Each structure stands twice: as structure tokens, then as C-alpha cells.
């Protein structure tokens, strides 16, 4: 178990840690989150009570170091910092009184949700999408645009997702215009899987990360990327069987976790009706189709 201590909580805030969230009042005696599994990946996110604009947060992996949160009264946000002096950190986190003012990561044992949602997500790939090499953790917020969006305005503060554009030369072989636009298998298998991602696990990792940034931060470009990566698979007549089966499970848990009141803003009616009811893979998403129909029949 690891601990993400907080120096203080000077401003009232809603704090998320992975799929959980709780509130902290202004200047409440709150010193952090205790009992976190080392895991492979985590996210801590914030939405200020007095200004719900800018949700923001940090992706991190406890294995890569000791992370703590300190509020910065100049920039006005809770900042993640790393302590390299592990003994000093162990001394602060040992502290029995400090632990009394910390909330415990509250994982039900039957609950494997967090890991179903992040199975393919790895910190080293996050750090390639979110470029800030001097930190081991990665900052994302509601307003950050994607590199692709920027091409249609600060490349430092951007989300470097893999560009997917169905009406581009990368997606369309000269001489195969109709073929490749109607059946995106070339673009999926040769360009993306063999060329860029190298395997389906890395593809799914970016798809999972995009989903989670859209859900936790309301990041619009992330939502666009999640939907595009889904549509690329579904619009391909030729897809490995293992990948289709795994896609059904990935999407099932994403749809299951989605806030029910957030379906108008996080689900694109067009894409999902194409994928479930019209595409080459309509029949390969049995569990996803079943949860969507019973949970969100209005969208369909």
C-alpha cells in the first residue's frame, strides 16, 4: 500500500482517486489518501467547489516514486510533487496522527473495476501522450487540446494522441479509395497496429486512457479520440478475433462505469449506432450492446 499525502487543503474541492471521489471543505484538516495498492497506474483529480471550471489532475504510478500534493496559492491549484528522500517521506507517512486525517483508498475485494478500466494503460505511454519529461507524473485538464485538434495552440500543453483521420492519405491507399474508406482494415491492421502501435495492447491502452480523460476531466478531444479508435475497429471487416472479444469487454466496463447523467455529453449517438447496428462488427460486441440497450436506450 502507498500513500499520497497532502500538505493541506486550503480550498474546498472535490477529489477523485481512480474511480472514487469525496469532498474536502475549505481548510478542513485533510492530509491525504492512505492504502492505495502500488498498482501499475492511478489518477488523482480535482474540481474546485467555488469554480467548477477546470477539472484537472495527475496520472501516476507509485512504483516510480513518492508523490504528494501541495496547494500553490499563486497558481491556485493542487500540485503534485515528488519526494526523492524516501526516508523523510516514510517518516511523514509513518505518522499515526497524520494517518488519522487521511482517507483510505476504499477498494471492495469483489471490485476489479479500476483494473478492467486500465488493464492496457501504462505510465510510460501516458508520458509520451503528455510530454513533460522532468516529472514522473502527468498533468491533464479539461481544456487541453489534442495535437490533431491543433492541426484543424501551445504544443507543450497538448495531448499527443495518435492522429486518426479517416479522410487522409495515411488512411487511404491511392488506387484503393472506395475499398479503404468503406473497409478500414488496411488502416487498422497495417498502418495502426503493425506500423504505429506495434500490438493491440498498446492500441487498447491509448483507447482506455482517452476514455478516462474524457470521463474524469470532461476533455473533449479525448472523447473524440476514444470514439475514433472504436469506430476504426468497428469499420474494419478484418480484425483479429482476440481483439474483437477484448474490445467487447473493454467497452462494457467503460459503459458500466459512465455516470448515468453524463450520457448526452460523453456518448456520440452517430458512432455508437454505427458500431452496434451497422458496422462490420455489429455482432461482435454482444455484451456492450446489451448494456447500452438496457442502460441508455434513448441514445439508440
Amino acid at each position: 500500500m502507498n500513500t499520497v499525502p497532502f500538505t493541506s487543503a486550503p480550498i474546498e474541492v472535490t477529489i477523485g482517486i481512480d474511480q472514487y471521489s469525496f469532498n474536502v471543505k475549505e481548510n478542513q484538516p485533510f492530509h491525504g489518501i492512505k492504502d492505495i495498492p502500488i498498482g501499475h497506474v492511478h489518477v488523482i483529480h480535482f474540481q474546485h467547489a467555488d469554480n467548477s471550471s477546470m477539472r484537472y489532475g495527475y496520472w501516476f504510478d507509485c512504483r516510480m516514486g513518492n508523490f504528494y500534493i501541495q496547494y500553490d496559492p499563486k497558481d491556485g491549484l493542487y500540485k503534485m510533487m515528488e519526494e526523492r528522500d524516501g526516508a523523510k517521506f516514510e517518516n511523514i507517512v509513518h505518522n499515526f496522527k497524520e494517518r488519522q486525517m487521511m482517507v483510505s483508498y476504499p477498494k471492495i475485494d469483489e471490485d476489479d473495476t479500476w483494473y478492467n478500466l486500465t488493464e492496457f494503460v501504462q505510465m510510460d505511454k501516458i508520458r509520451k501522450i503528455v510530454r513533460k519529461d522532468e516529472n514522473q507524473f502527468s498533468y491533464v485538464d479539461s481544456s487541453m487540446t489534442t495535437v490533431q485538434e491543433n492541426e484543424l495552440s501551445d504544443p507543450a500543453h497538448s495531448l499527443n494522441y495518435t492522429v486518426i483521420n479517416f479522410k487522409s492519405r495515411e488512411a487511404i491507399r491511392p488506387g484503393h479509395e472506395m475499398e479503404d474508406f468503406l473497409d478500414k482494415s488496411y488502416y487498422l491492421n497495417t498502418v495502426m497496429l503493425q506500423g504505429i502501435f506495434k500490438n493491440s495492447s498498446n492500441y487498447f491502452g491509448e483507447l482506455q486512457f482517452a476514455f478516462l480523460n474524457a470521463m474524469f476531466f470532461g476533455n473533449y478531444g479525448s472523447s473524440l479520440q476514444w470514439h475514433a479508435m472504436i469506430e476504426l475497429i468497428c469499420s474494419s471487416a478484418t480484425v483479429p478475433k482476440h481483439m474483437l472479444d477484448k474490445l467487447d469487454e473493454i467497452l462494457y466496463y467503460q459503459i458500466k462505469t459512465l455516470p448515468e447523467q453524463y450520457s448526452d455529453i460523453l456518448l456520440n449517438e452517430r458512432v455508437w449506432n454505427i458500431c452496434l447496428y451497422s458496422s462490420f462488427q455489429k455482432n461482435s460486441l454482444h455484451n456492450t450492446e446489451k448494456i447500452m440497450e438496457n442502460k441508455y436506450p434513448e441514445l439508440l
Binding site: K167, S168, R169, I172, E177, M178, F181
Partner: protein, 237 residues
């Protein structure tokens, strides 16, 4: 963006633009089989690609052999149109390539954009103008060359004949769409209007009769009357 009538004059600025109409690419007759079924038979068609400023019409004849052994022909026809328009653009010297291609049917947008990826600076757009280019096959010389073709063929016409010697491109395009709307609305009566007088002939190198300026005013009036008469008949006005 989508074109219309606030910017109707813009069609005649100096940016080269082409209209593309695909409504006569895939054409069929519908007839009953021996077993009693009904069967289609394709007949030759054409892509109608027009420069509205100059009158230059690039008529690509679509021979029925291109459909042989193909499925989903309505869908294929859009991609075939897009293939041929892209080929036309590539065949043109750079200074003659359009800055905009305006498709009369929105279903042409994605096929054409995908075939024109090599030309990112060429805008591909629909229009809110309802244009009567589907009546192009009512122009006898165009219909003749399409129906006589035994192989794919491209034929160049000036759909304004020599009118630009005397009127503006704006006026010529208005005359053309009036004529074509009348042909679409009541083809046999529109042809009677145009051909009723044997002393006004069609030059060997023209599509329309050699009307004088005053005769064109009269013809245009008779075409407007034809269109209004048919409106009244249709809606019992």
C-alpha cells in the same frame, strides 16, 4: 461551405470552380422478365462537370460496361464519378485546376473528398441551389453522343454556345438553368418552343438555336410561362 443565393454572383468571380452533377451516371430502364419478375437494364450515362463562368462542359460518358459484374451500383456510381472528376483535375494544367468543386448532391462529398486527397487546397462543397442539371440528357446533341458511345469517352462542349460574346456569365448561367428547368418540367413543350421555327437553326458547333437578342427574350418569356403553367397544373392554382 454550402453555396446558394446571397453569394450567387460569387459563382462568377475569377476563382475557377466546377459544378459536378452525378444524377445521370447510373441510368436504367425497368422491364418485366419472362418469369414475371422485373429487371433493370443499364444504359449509357454521363458525368456533368461544368465551369459556370466559361460554359465549358466536360462530359464524361459512362459506358454500361463499367457496371459489369459489379454490386451496389448506386454506391459505386458515386465513387466512379469521384474517380473520373479527380482524373479530370489531374489532367488539367495547374493554372486551370479549380479552387472549388460544388457537388449538386451531398452524397458525392465523401467519395470526392477521398479521391481528391492529393489536392488539399481544392475545396469540395455542396450547395443549397436546386439546379436542373439532371435535364442535361434532354439536350439532343448531348443525349446523342452518350447513347452512341461504344466505349468510355470524354467530350468537351461549351454549353453557352457563343452567348458570352453578347451577355455576361451570370446572365448565361441564368438562361441555361431556365432552359434546363423548362426541359425538366415539360420536355416536349420546351423542345416545341425551341424548335417550332424551322428558320432559326442550330449551328453545327452549337447546342442551342441561333436566336437573336430579342428572340431570346421571347424564348425566355415562353419558358417562364411554361414553368408557371406547370406549377398551376400541379398544385391546382
Amino acid at each position: 461551405g454550402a453555396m446558394n443565393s446571397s453569394n450567387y454572383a460569387e459563382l462568377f468571380n475569377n476563382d475557377i470552380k466546377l459544378f459536378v452533377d452525378d444524377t445521370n451516371v447510373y441510368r436504367v430502364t425497368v422491364h418485366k422478365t419472362f418469369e414475371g419478375n422485373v429487371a433493370t437494364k443499364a444504359i449509357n450515362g454521363c458525368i456533368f462537370t461544368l465551369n459556370p463562368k466559361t460554359g465549358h462542359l466536360f462530359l464524361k460518358i459512362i459506358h454500361t460496361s463499367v457496371w459489369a459484374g459489379q454490386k451496389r451500383l448506386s454506391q459505386l456510381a458515386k465513387w466512379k464519378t469521384a474517380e473520373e472528376v479527380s482524373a479530370l483535375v489531374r489532367s488539367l494544367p495547374k493554372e486551370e485546376q479549380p479552387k472549388q468543386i460544388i457537388v449538386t448532391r451531398k452524397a458525392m462529398l465523401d467519395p470526392l473528398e477521398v479521391h481528391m486527397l492529393d489536392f488539399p487546397n481544392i475545396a469540395i462543397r455542396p450547395t443549397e441551389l436546386r439546379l436542373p442539371f439532371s435535364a442535361a440528357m434532354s439536350i439532343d446533341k448531348l443525349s446523342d453522343v452518350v447513347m452512341k458511345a461504344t466505349e468510355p469517352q470524354m467530350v468537351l462542349f461549351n454549353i453557352y454556345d457563343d452567348w458570352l460574346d453578347r451577355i455576361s456569365s451570370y446572365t448565361a448561367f441564368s438562361r441555361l438553368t431556365l432552359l434546363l428547368r423548362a426541359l425538366k418540367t415539360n420536355e416536349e413543350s420546351a423542345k416545341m418552343i425551341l424548335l417550332s421555327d424551322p428558320t432559326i437553326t442550330i449551328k453545327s458547333y452549337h447546342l442551342w438555336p441561333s436566336f437573336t437578342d430579342e428572340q431570346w427574350i421571347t424564348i425566355e418569356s415562353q419558358m417562364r410561362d411554361l414553368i408557371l403553367t406547370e406549377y398551376g397544373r400541379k398544385y391546382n392554382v
